[PDB]
Amino acid sequence: AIGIGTLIIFIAMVLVAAVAAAVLINTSGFLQQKAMATGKESTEQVASGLLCS
């Protein structure tokens, strides 16, 4: 009798961990974009300019 239930709740544990992992993976992706963008943009700003002759 006991055995049956153990299996069922095990399935839930798996799925819930999976769902949480998805958040972390996705979020890391979302940040990767902006992280790079900010650095490149900021460098181009400080480095570039024109000079009166």
User: Residues in the site for a second copy, rule: CB under 8 A?
Assistant: 4, 8, 11-12, 15, 39, 42-43, 46-47, 49
At closest approach, how far in Å is the CB of 7 from a second copy?
Answer: 9
Q: Report the nearest approach of a second copy to the CB of residue 51 (Å).
A: 8
Helix ranges (DSSP H) in the chain: 2-47
- Cα separation, 25 vs 44, in Å, equals 30
With respect to a second copy, which residue has the nearer C-beta, 3 or 33?
3
CB of 10 to a second copy, least distance (A): 10
